[PDB]
Write a protein that binds this ligand. Structure first.
Ligand code: NA
Ligand code: NA
Length: 102
């Protein structure tokens, strides 16, 4: 019933299209359109990777410290580190690191 593993480009495209239709808060409804994926999965894929919005251009020291400790722990695993930062996607973190923390 439920599928696991990597998100395909087709699935990512689908989530974006459905968010435009239902908005960023009917995750269970959006999930009905994706084979084997549930609301929670779609929600996290959006907030941790797909969301194109930029709401905060500055970073706090608390965020930097979390990234630094996670990097020592895991290395350059942006997708995993993104799970630890409430308002950041993996790409946001990757760029912040290479231009300010590296
Ligand atoms: Na589904
Ligand atoms: Na995040």
């Amino acid at each position: 019933e439920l599928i696991k593993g990597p998100w395909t480009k087709e699935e990512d495209q689908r989530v974006i299209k459905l968010v435009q239709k239902y908005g960023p808060k009917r995750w269970s409804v959006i999930a009905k359109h994706l084979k084997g994926r549930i609301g929670k999965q779609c929600r996290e894929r959006w907030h941790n990777h797909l969301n194109p919005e930029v709401k905060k251009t500055s970073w706090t020291e608390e965020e930097d410290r979390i990234i630094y400790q996670a990097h020592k722990r895991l290395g350059n695993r942006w997708a995993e580190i993104a799970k630890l930062l409430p308002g950041r996607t993996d790409n946001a973190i990757k760029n912040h690191w290479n231009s300010t923390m590296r």
